[PDB]
């Protein structure tokens with residue numbers, strides 16, 4: 001009877017940490033997808049900003065020559 | 069065994085006394101703390117009554133014993149009886165003289181200064197004890213694992229103690245003393261049983277409650293859901309045919325009394341559940357001390373063997389408290405003797421000399437010698 | 444490695460110590476400068492407390508440590524602790540004896556003459572150091588590029604230094620010493636957080652501020668325009684769930700504290716922004732020296748890694764100053780170890796013999812031998 | 819380590835056996851002695867895979883490969899279950915008699931290996 005309680009308790013303890021872990025893991029997995037999308041989005045914008053400021057570097061240069 | 073004085077090991081409480089031989093690991097003789105009179109007249113000549121009856125002698129035959137409780141949290145109604153209670157332990161069973169071996173005792177935190185001296189007076193003056201000491205309950209349960217950073221909660225029949233002793237002891241208040249353990253649980257059940265008619269009146273059957281309690285009674289996980297379960301007669305109605313002769317179906321009575329632990333409102337006090345007092349001892353200390361406290365919480369005391377005592381802690385602690393570290397409570401399986409395990413150590417330590425009291429040391433600094441120097 | 448005495452490389456500050464093996468390029472062991480007591484009572488027997496805790500040992504477990512700061516700009520409240528701080532570095536990690544290899548240290552400009560001798564006394568008298576030296580922070584960060592004409596601004600946790608060291612050192616005043624770096628930033632935030640309710644009181648969590656700071660906090664480009672941006676909750680509200688368990692949305696708190704750098708008026712002083720002090724060091728020197736100074740401005744110190752620290756300089760310097768040369772500030776990417784890079788050099792130089800101090804040289808000219816001959 | 823470069827037990831074995839029978843240790847007495855090691859070798863196999871069973875408290879010691887712990891008690895011919903429940907777990911009650919052993923005390927691997 002006592003052995004049953006010991007194991008029965010372990011079941012409640014195992015079930016508790018399982019549903020809690022899976023619950024947060026699922027939430028985390030879904031969050032990663034959102035963060036990953038944001039990473040891809042920000043990276044894309046950074047690429048557009050990088051190629052733009054570079055275009056100004058060659059633009060400000062040619063204008064400096066014409067001014068001289 | 070023979071060579072070297074060899075010191076004994078003891079741990080007296082306000083309900084159950086723990087004492088054995090010397091150099092042992094666990095208590096060898098655990099007699100109950102009871103001493104009453106024969107309100108009745110003993111047969112008066114079928115022995116000159118006296119002996120209020122004690123030890124396995126009294127517990128075996130309560131019937132005709134008006135069990136008189138001498139030690140009630142702090143105040144000892146009478147010391148005269150305690151003298152003949154200790155005259156039984158060392159001799160009748162251990163068969164060894166204290167006028168030969170040292171002695172170790174436990175200290176109930178925040179106990180009147182006059183008491184620690186009254187006891188020592190009995191030893192030094194009469195039982196001639198050149199060497200002894202009185203250590204602090206919880207701290208002993210500590211030094212017996214493998215780390216110097218854990219919070220301890222030690223209690224049994226005396227009073228509850230929330231002692232966050234890990235790296236050191238005593239700073240602002242942190243520690244707590246609550247008169248609500250063992251004897252308090254035995255006293256509360258009889259009051260609540262009166263609702264069903266059952267009324268264990270005298271103090272003799274009062275003990276039977278405690279005996280029956282530690283066999284089936286358990287703690288409510290959630291009183292709300294368990295109340296609706298009462299409709300069924302399987303998990304509730306429990307069988308326990310009185311050794312006398314009358315079954316007591318302790319169904320909703322088992323998980324009713326323990327609720328008082330989490331709800332001290334049922335015993336006329338403002339004290340919150342044991343999970344609030346946990347915060348009360350954590351919020352006081354530094355900020356960068358918490359993350360590791362949750363990772364280690366020592367729970368000592370045989371009182372913490374009630375089914376449904378540990379699993380509840382994880383539910384209430386994780387609620388109103390920081391939740392990004394490892395919440396972990398160390399509840400030693402046999403946590404009742406955790407103090408006894410640590411006791412056998414102090415009695416064998418050599419550094420102990422730096423702490424203990426010598427015969428002459430008691431006369432030089434007077435009676436206060438003990439708690440006037442140590443803590 | 445084996446042949447030739449082989450000298451070590453070190454760089455002690457008032458917040459973080461940088462030290463490694465010998466003949467290296469970068470620090471191998473960078474332990475924090477902390478040493479407190481157990482205000483609490485250690486377990487007192489669960490080790491004879493002492494060790495205020497230090498190194499990764501103390502930083503790992505702040506909780507029960509009353510972090511006592513020994514070195515506060517110039518004055519060392521107590522030297523006794525410093526002795527056992529250096530007894531850990533050379534041995535516990537490096538596993539090499541200073542009674543065998545030379546030693547190199549850094550010099551905090553304008554430090555009491557009595558201090559430079561007190562330190563050397565610890566080496567020559569006890570740690571037997573026949574050869575050592577103490578060089579000047581900024582000048583080391585210099586000799587490591589490819590020109591003999593640049594102005595340097597070196598600082599970290601100690602005090603700010605605007606040293607226009609390029610062709611030579613010391614003439615009228617130019618150089619500046621300002622007690623406003625590292626530790627000052629960590630102390631100011633907690634005061635300003637009180638406006639929102641957050642109050643990191645004790646000195647333990649005070650360090651947590653510094654830890655959190657170097658992960659998200661940044662400097663305001665223009666506090667005026669950024670204030671109106673507060674209306675939005677995207678660039679402001681930053682996420683940082685306390686490892687304990689309570690999020691702190693550091694939005695307008697990130698770019699608020701750094702404003703003090705440019706506005707010392709918020710810390711009770713008449714000192715102007717770091718772009719005025721720049722003029723203060725340029726206007727003093729000759730007239731035909733400026734055009735090339737603007738073309739090269741060295742900015743060393745890991746403190747200059749806060750996002751929005753370099754781009755602001757071009758805005759304020761070009762304002763109230765000559766504007767017909769090449770305004771250019773060299774802010775080394777990893778400019779924290781710029782001193783360590785130069786340190787490994789001096790320790791390997793042979794001309795160093797013309798500068799360093801020999802065992803006998805300390806006794807012939809007395810203790811003042813060091814700063815009585817060199818500069 | 820297993821094989822030693824200097825020692826050749828395959829040949830040295832004949833020197834020990836010559837000492838076994840010569841004195842007075844017949845194979846009967848030998849087997850008897852080996853029955854002790856035979857058990858120990860059946861008990862020795864009892865290894866553990868750090869069992870983090872306890873949700874929080876203290877990591878217990880689990881033995882999935884029970885045949886090693888079973889063979890351990892087979893030689894002793896004792897209850898495989900009770901044995902593990904009465905050794906790895908400490909127990910005491912007491913009251914003039916001599917206690918009823920059953921209560922459980924799972925402990926860390928170090929103490930478990932220590933007791934082993």
Ligand SMILES: Nc1ncnc2c1ncn2[C@@H]1O[C@H](COP(=O)(O)OP(=O)(O)O)[C@@H](O)[C@H]1O
Nearest residue numbers: 081082083084224225226250282370371373404
């Ligand atoms: N197996 C058990 N399960 C639950 N409670 C128990 C068990 N054995 C003893 N107790 C209880 O433990 C308490 C005595 O514990 P103890 O540590 O001796 O207390 P104290 O030292 O405060 O006198 C009593 O309330 C008793 O009913």
Ligand SMILES: Nc1ncnc2c1ncn2[C@@H]1O[C@H](COP(=O)(O)OP(=O)(O)O)[C@@H](O)[C@H]1O
Nearest residue numbers: 456457458459599600601625657745746748779
């Ligand atoms: N990655 C980082 N970004 C910004 N600040 C940093 C970074 N790493 C360290 N710091 C900061 O640099 C300072 C320590 O720099 P350091 O050069 O060691 O100073 P000091 O020598 O004056 O003690 C601390 O204020 C710390 O928070």
Ligand SMILES: [Ca+2]
Nearest residue numbers: 223224225226
């Ligand atoms: Ca107690």
Ligand SMILES: [Ca+2]
Nearest residue numbers: 598599600601
């Ligand atoms: Ca510095």
